Amino acid sequence: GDTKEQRILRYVQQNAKPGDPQSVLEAIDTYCTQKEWAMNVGDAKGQIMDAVIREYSPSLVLELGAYCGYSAVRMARLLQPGARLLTMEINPDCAAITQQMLNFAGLQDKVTILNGASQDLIPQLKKKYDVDTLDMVFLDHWKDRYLPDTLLLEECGLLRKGTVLLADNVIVPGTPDFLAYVRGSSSFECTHYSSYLEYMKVVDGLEKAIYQGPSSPDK
Numbered sequence: 015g016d017t018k019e020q021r022i023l024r025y026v027q028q029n030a031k032p033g034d035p036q037s038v039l040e041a042i043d044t045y046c047t048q049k050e051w052a053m054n055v056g057d058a059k060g061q062i063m064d065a066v067i068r069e070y071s072p073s074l075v076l077e078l079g080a081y082c083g084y085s086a087v088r089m090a091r092l093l094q095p096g097a098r099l100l101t102m103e104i105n106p107d108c109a110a111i112t113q114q115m116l117n118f119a120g121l122q123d124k125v126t127i128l129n130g131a132s133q134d135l136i137p138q139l140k141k142k143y144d145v146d147t148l149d150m151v152f153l154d155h156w157k158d159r160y161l162p163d164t165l166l167l168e169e170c171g172l173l174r175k176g177t178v179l180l181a182d183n184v185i186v187p188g189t190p191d192f193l194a195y196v197r198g199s200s201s202f203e204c205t206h207y208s209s210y211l212e213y214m215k216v217v218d219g220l221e222k223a224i225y226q227g228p229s230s231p232d233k
């Protein structure tokens with residue numbers, strides 16, 4: 015029967031306008047703040063994401079954890095012609111919702127949705143999806159996977175100097191292992207973007223970690 019994710023999608027299809035990504039974002043944010051709570055990056059963090067995308071104008075973006083497609087719509091709407099978003103989603107029903115969301119938004123040709131676990135899919139990017147290196151990675155999937163997937167991206171050769179990692183929810187509920195690693199490592203140049211979760215009345219944040227290249231062996 016009915017699910018919250020189906021309801022989000024229906025609300026968008028009813029109230030937003032096809033081919034208009036901004037209206038889709040606004041409908042989702044309206045739904046999640048007025049009608050029914052849902053895992054959602056939200057407009058405040060959304061504006062931080064927008065600014066990062068505009069600053070670095072990435073040609074190839076990897077998103078981990080699409081859910082209903084809010085972040086995919088958010089980022090893909092700002093991508094240049096020929097730029098690509100690859101988004102990974104472990105739940106088949108959510109992957110389907112994300113595809114319909116993007117189709118409605120008119121962004122389906124900018125996005126490839128991969129249905130599976132990050133640690134299974136990431137090592138296939140070079141062979142199967144013609145990836146050299148990624149320009150940007152958005153992490154918003156299972157929080158205990160931020161660190162191991164970041165380490166995996168590095169060893170698979172998917173990061174280059176200047177690749178931007180942007181990670182959500184690093185304070186609430188928190189990813190302290192990930193923060194300790196990237197802030198402490200000379201391979202990552204880190205900045206923190208605080209943002210309030212009003213519905214929870216606690217400050218959260220996004221971490222931006224810019225890959226510097228691998229660590230040098232001792233001489």
Ligand SMILES: COc1ccc([C@@H](C)c2cc(-c3sc(C)nc3C)[nH]n2)cc1
Binds near residue numbers: 080105131132154156
């Ligand atoms: C309980 O916290 C959460 C957080 C996020 C999600 C959704 C957004 C999600 C997570 C994923 C994963 S997990 C994994 C090993 N690879 C992927 C691609 N896809 N989609 C669900 C529950």
Ligand code: NA
Binds near residue numbers: 182183
């Ligand atoms: Na999130």
Ligand code: NA
Binds near residue numbers: 197200
């Ligand atoms: Na660092």
